[PDB]
Design a protein around this ligand. Structure first.
Ligand SMILES: O=C(Cn1cc(CNS(=O)(=O)c2ccc(I)cc2)nn1)N1CCC(c2nc(-c3cccs3)no2)CC1
Ligand SMILES: O=C(Cn1cc(CNS(=O)(=O)c2ccc(I)cc2)nn1)N1CCC(c2nc(-c3cccs3)no2)CC1
Lengths: 194, 194
């Protein structure tokens, strides 16, 4: 029963490796899950709804991993703090490229997908800004840009730059260079007096 | 004759202020241009092709304005140099929000639109990297990240962050704050030793 829902999700993730959601039919999904098409419709109203659930799982896995980090002491220098935090997103979405690619595309045609992404981006921006505020309050970071606006730009850079790297877009930073690139820009802009 | 092509382009830009390309018919475009539908088809094979031409015009206007700056002496401090350069993009695309918004959407469904955008992004990244290289060669900027990878991330941040601001996305930096935000991040990451 839940095996059937999970089988549908796994099929969808597999199939998305090789083709876009448009090129995947409910029949394909039902076939791979070892169920009929009307049984599929018991579990999901559409193939679009299966993508939403896949993306919700990955997004929540990233969010939970960040929350785990936030709850640690984790004694290391400031650069290494930002790196471990950005690395949560690099590894989580990097482990789920087909879902990442499919989810990004579906922001344009799905209000629930756009809303899911927006809700989590606002959360991650708020956490970034709160950590910046703490760094300022302890005297480690200078009071330059408004912390929330800084957080916003840096998070949007990550969104676009991680994605370009994972998709192999032209232009893109090689995936093997993107962590180091993002961390440099976060650290110099957060701690830089100029 | 060219008046007719330009009339079609102007109509399309006007209509895109209020609705997406999907919600605009060839009939609407022909109507606004004061021509018949088959006359329209003489000028453009599709409404999609009209968008491509609009975007090509804006993109080339940004590119030409940047080339003009590059060809100036323009005696000012380094922060102000980057600001005037980023400001080319802020003003050009900011003056053409409907075309910007429509073009961004069409990257997903149009290979010519994706290719146009990619070609210019590669150009602007290469120019950014060349200016960074010059700053390093004169001893003004430190030899930190590979200049082309740095340029790439900073340009992608601008692409996504300018666009979020112009679209009024949640999350976004207010349009009245985005220039200052981008310039801070470019200047600290280019000149920052850490
Ligand atoms: O990268 C992000 C947020 N983010 C995540 C993404 C995902 N990019 S992506 O994979 O290409 C993607 C794009 C679109 C879609 I739909 C799905 C995925 N873009 N931005 N961060 C970096 C680290 C920030 C942070 N770290 C920390 C700490 C580090 C160490 C201790 S606390 N505090 O805040 C939180 C948000
Ligand atoms: O911002 C960019 C490139 N860019 C432009 C954009 C457009 N963003 S946008 O408007 O939201 C948009 C997004 C998507 C689409 I389709 C159309 C528009 N994104 N990135 N720059 C900043 C300045 C860089 C530069 N300045 C300079 C100099 C400054 C002063 C002397 S030389 N040299 O390189 C060149 C590229």
């Amino acid at each position: 029963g839940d095996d059937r829902e999970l089988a549908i999700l796994a099929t969808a993730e597999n199939l998305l490796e090789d083709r876009p959601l448009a090129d995947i039919s409910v029949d394909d999904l039902a076939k791979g899950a070892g169920i009929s098409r009307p049984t599929f419709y018991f579990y999901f109203p559409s193939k679009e709804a299966v993508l939403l659930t896949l993306l919700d799982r990955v997004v929540n896995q990233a969010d939970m991993a960040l929350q785990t980090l936030a709850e640690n002491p984790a004694d290391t220098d400031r650069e290494n703090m930002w790196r471990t935090g950005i690395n949560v997103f690099f590894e989580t979405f990097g482990s789920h490229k087909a879902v990442t690619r499919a989810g990004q595309a579906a922001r344009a045609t799905s209000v629930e997908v756009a809303e899911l992404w927006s809700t989590f981006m606002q959360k991650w921006i708020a956490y970034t800004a709160a950590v910046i505020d703490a760094e300022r309050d302890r005297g480690a970071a200078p009071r330059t840009l408004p912390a929330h606006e800084l957080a916003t730009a840096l998070n949007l850079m990550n969104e676009r730059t991680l994605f370009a790297s994972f998709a192999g877009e032209q232009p893109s930073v090689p995936e093997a260079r993107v962590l180091d690139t993002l961390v440099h820009i976060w650290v110099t802009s957060i701690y830089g007096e100029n």
